[PDB]
Amino acid sequence: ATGGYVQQATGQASFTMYSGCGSPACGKAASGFTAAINQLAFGSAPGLGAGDACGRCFALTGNHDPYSPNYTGPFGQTIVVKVTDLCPVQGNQEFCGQTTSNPTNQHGMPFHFNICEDTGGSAKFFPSGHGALTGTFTEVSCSQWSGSDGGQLWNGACLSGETAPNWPSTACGNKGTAPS
Numbered sequence: 058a059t060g061g062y063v064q065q066a067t068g069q070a071s072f073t074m075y076s077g078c079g080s081p082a083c084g085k086a087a088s089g090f091t092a093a094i095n096q097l098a099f100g101s102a103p104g105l106g107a108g109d110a111c112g113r114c115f116a117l118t119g120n121h122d123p124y125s126p127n128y129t130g131p132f133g134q135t136i137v138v139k140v141t142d143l144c145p146v147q148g149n150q151e152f153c154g155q156t157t158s159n160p161t162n163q164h165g166m167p168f169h170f171n172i173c174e175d176t177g178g179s180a181k182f183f184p185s186g187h188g189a190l191t192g193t194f195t196e197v198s199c200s201q202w203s204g205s206d207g208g209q210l211w212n213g214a215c216l217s218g219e220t221a222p223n224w225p226s227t228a229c230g231n232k233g234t235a236p237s
């Protein structure tokens with residue numbers, strides 16, 4: 058893929074929650090559930106704007122708590138998020154530190170979704186007392202996602218993944234070079 062980013066429609070991921078996604082890396086926020094995806098999958102770097110993950114919708118399913126591996130539920134609900142943001146390698150190595158040298162994070166996962174609290178996704182996805190999970194993701198039509206996109210924050214903002222074909226088909230396009 059352009060830039061050496063690692064971008065696939067379905068796979069295994071870890072999951073955490075974060076807040077403050079009103080000025081996200083794609084340059085448009087959204088009112089439905091949203092997430093940041095790890096940098097290696099996002100397709101950009103801090104400051105460079107939108108990458109090719111932008112606007113794509115994914116069904117996320119948490120099925121394991123790696124910090125308490127004998128917990129077997131209840132988990133949260135499967136949710137559909139729209140990717141609006143970038144979870145950078147910097148400062149977030151445990152979960153978002155996938156790079157060309159180390160394509161899996163500390164939980165052995167090649168992808169990570171950081172689900173934004175601001176529009177409620179994390180409240181549905183994480184059971185009380187279990188704020189970090191592993192499980193699966195699958196790219197789905199954004200017709201399965203509920204919400205509306207926000208206005209552009211800056212020129213070149215992009216959420217065109219919302220109607221593009223599944224990865225590895227492209228949409229917004231990658232910027233720069235994959236983290237190494």
Ligand SMILES: OC[C@H]1O[C@@H](O[C@H]2[C@H](O)[C@@H](O)[C@H](O[C@H]3[C@H](O)[C@@H](O)[C@H](O[C@H]4[C@H](O)[C@@H](O)[C@H](O[C@H]5[C@H](O)[C@@H](O)[C@@H](O)O[C@@H]5CO)O[C@@H]4CO)O[C@@H]3CO)O[C@@H]2CO)[C@H](O)[C@@H](O)[C@@H]1O
Nearest residue numbers: 075080081082093102103104105106143144171211212213
């Ligand atoms: O006018 C000059 C030129 O501007 C071009 O637009 C600029 C724009 O001015 C600038 O504001 C914009 O900045 C983006 C930046 O590109 C993007 O990487 C950044 O993404 C952040 C995001 O806001 C955070 O939510 C996210 O938080 C993470 C935490 O940092 C992390 O610790 C962890 O908790 O995980 C969080 C995410 O889960 O970090 C992201 C990555 O840093 O957002 C900025 C604000 O939107 O950049 C654009 C593009 O360069 C314009 O295109 C051009 O035409 C014009 O001439």
Ligand SMILES: OC[C@H]1O[C@@H](O[C@H]2[C@H](O)[C@@H](O)[C@H](O[C@H]3[C@H](O)[C@@H](O)[C@H](O[C@H]4[C@H](O)[C@@H](O)[C@H](O[C@H]5[C@H](O)[C@@H](O)[C@H](O)O[C@@H]5CO)O[C@@H]4CO)O[C@@H]3CO)O[C@@H]2CO)[C@H](O)[C@@H](O)[C@@H]1O
Nearest residue numbers: 072073074075076122124125149152153171186187188189
């Ligand atoms: O960088 C990405 C993103 O991170 C967000 O912050 C994350 C952070 O990165 C994670 O490390 C953190 O993970 C914590 C879990 O949310 C939390 O549920 C888990 O709690 C454990 C607890 O530590 C553990 O000791 C406890 O064990 C109990 C057993 O389960 C019981 O059976 C037994 O009886 O008793 C023991 C002792 O109590 O289990 C629980 C559940 O597993 O701890 C993790 C480590 O602290 O999650 C954060 C939120 O997602 C950050 O918000 C974002 O800004 C950032 O972008």
Ligand SMILES: CC(CCO)CCO
Nearest residue numbers: 078079086087088175
């Ligand atoms: C203002 C939020 C969306 C409201 O629907 C953006 C994330 O903070």
Ligand SMILES: CC(CCO)CCO
Nearest residue numbers: 102103104105106211
């Ligand atoms: C200089 C940045 C914007 C600061 O608001 C973008 C490039 O990192």
Ligand SMILES: CC(CCO)CCO
Nearest residue numbers: 088089175176177178
């Ligand atoms: C405000 C929460 C639910 C609204 O019904 C999340 C949406 O931001």
Ligand SMILES: CC(CCO)CCO
Nearest residue numbers: 079080081209210211
């Ligand atoms: C990137 C925005 C930050 C808002 O807090 C400014 C440009 O719209």
Ligand SMILES: CC(CCO)CCO
Nearest residue numbers: 217220221222227228
């Ligand atoms: C950028 C487009 C993908 C082209 O196949 C999306 C059109 O909305």
